[PDB]
Every structure is written in C-alpha cells, then in structure tokens.
Structure 1
Amino acid sequence: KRIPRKTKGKSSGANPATAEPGTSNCEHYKARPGIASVQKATESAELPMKNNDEGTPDKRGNTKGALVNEHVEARDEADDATKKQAKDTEKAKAQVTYSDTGINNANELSRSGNVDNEGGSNQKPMSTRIAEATSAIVSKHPA
C-alpha cells in the first residue's frame, strides 16, 4: 500500500467451450520501419534536458561551479559539446561542430561559478566572506 520515495534526504527533513473463433497468436507481419529500431530512437530522444546548474547558490550560500572566466568557460564548453557529438557519431571528427563556425562570437558569455549574484567574484567563498566580516566584531570578558 505504501508507495516508495525517490529523492528523500535520509535525514528525513464439461465447461462452455472457451475456444473462441478468431483468436490466434501468430506473427505474420514484420513492421516496415522496425518496432525495435523506432523504439530505441524514441527512447534516445525521450531523455530530459541536462540540468545546467552553474552559478546557482548553495544552502550555505556559496555559488557552484569552477573559477574560470565566462568566455573561457563558453569556449571550452562548446569544445566539450563538439567532442561529445564526435563520440555520438563514432568518427574522428564530427561533421557538425560548434567551434569551427566562421561567425565571430567573442562576446558570448556562459554561466560559470566565477561571479556572485551581487556582481562580485568568488575569489573567497561567500560563507567565509561573511565569516571574517562578522568576526571583525568581537568582545570578550575583561581580564
């Protein structure tokens, strides 16, 4: 009766003849497109889109990603996509590429973990950035 749960944080917070005229199980027809092939292609296309989870904050508040410049991230990421397409095609060079395009695209920016939401750079994580700011105010009991 209980349906399971997929994503939980573990922390929890002499009989009438029944032979019927006309029912026979046999296969005389082969599907022209191919049921297996079309089903495999549909399964491949069925997948949902990738979770682009860059620059998004954490529960603590630190932004996630790699400390790289935005345009460098865009270029390397397009190159990775081209390599992935090449592997999908199973050739040394993919016919369809995202890096040999003749169009100049130097202004392209892709989301990375370099920039905070406020507009600064995560040279120091936001948690520590708050930590020293708060610890700059201390007061102990007199000796």
Structure 2
Amino acid sequence: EHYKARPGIASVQKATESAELPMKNNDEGTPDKRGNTKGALVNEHVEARDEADDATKKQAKDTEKAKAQVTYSDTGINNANELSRSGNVDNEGGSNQK
C-alpha cells in the first residue's frame, strides 16, 4: 500500500451506496388483489400535508440537528388547491368508506 486515495475511496463508496438507493414505492390509491384500494381513509388535503410534515420530520432525523433547515411544510407559498394519492376515493370516483 503506497497511494492513499486523495478524496478517500471508501468515503466516496459509502456516499455512492447511499445515492444508489432505488425508487421508493407509492402504491396507495391503487386496487388490491380483491378490488379495494390500499390507502388509509384520509382525504388528500390532509393526507399530503401529513406526509409532507412526516418527510420534513424524517429529514430532520436524517440530519444531526433537531429543527430541519430544508423543510417541505409551511414553506411560504400556499398549497390549498392540492391533492395527492391515497385511499379515500376509489377508481370509480366515489368514497371508499365501504
């Protein structure tokens, strides 16, 4: 061994392992085996605000700090005409309370 890696070969290796990570599934709102949706009985205007707050919370957990610098919830612009995918509505357009 003579040549040290000048940026650090394993230190790049861990970071590119982390950057390798594939695309996370988002399967809610889609029909299951039987024909039902796979969501949580939440309408989307609370659902997307909920998952945005949870993504900011996971971002703060990923950082060492307690309050996250980059945030996704209450950024400064409003998001009232917004709706994500979840399992309130079926494919047909009605309420999946049954």
Q: Deviations over 1:43-89 (max 9, x none)?
A: 00001011001101011001001001111000000000000000111
Report the CA distance between 1:108 and its aligned residue: 1.2
Separation in 2, partners of 1:120, 1:100:
30
Unaligned runs of 5+ in 2: none
Deviations 1:3-53 (A, max 9, x none): xxxxxxxxxxxxxxxxxxxxxxxx111001101110000000001011001
How many angstroms apart in 2 are the aligned matches of 1:100 and 1:116? 29
Q: TM-score, normalised by structure 1?
A: 0.66
TM-score by length of 2: 0.96
- 1:15 corresponds to which residue? none
Task: Tell me the alpha carbon deviations over residues 83-110 of structure 1, each in whole angstroms, 9 at most, x when there is no partner.
Answer: 0000111211110000131111111101
Higher RCO (CA 8 Å, separation ≥ 6 residues): 2
* Structure 1 runs (4+) greater than 2 angstroms displaced: none
Q: Distance in 2 between matches of 1:52 and 1:59?
A: 16
Does residue 92 of structure 1 match 2:61? no
Aligned-residue CA RMSD (Å):
0.7
Structure 1, unmatched stretches of 5+, are: 1-26, 124-143
Q: Distance in 2 between matches of 1:111 and 1:59?
A: 18
The equivalences for 1:118-129 within 5 A come to 118-123=92-97
Per-residue CA shift, 1:113-143, capped at 9, x if unaligned?
00000100101xxxxxxxxxxxxxxxxxxxx
Match of 2:24 among 23, 45, 50: 50
Q: Secondary structure at the match of 1:113?
A: coil
CA distance in 2: counterparts of 1:106 and 1:68, whole angstroms: 16
- The aligned length equals 97
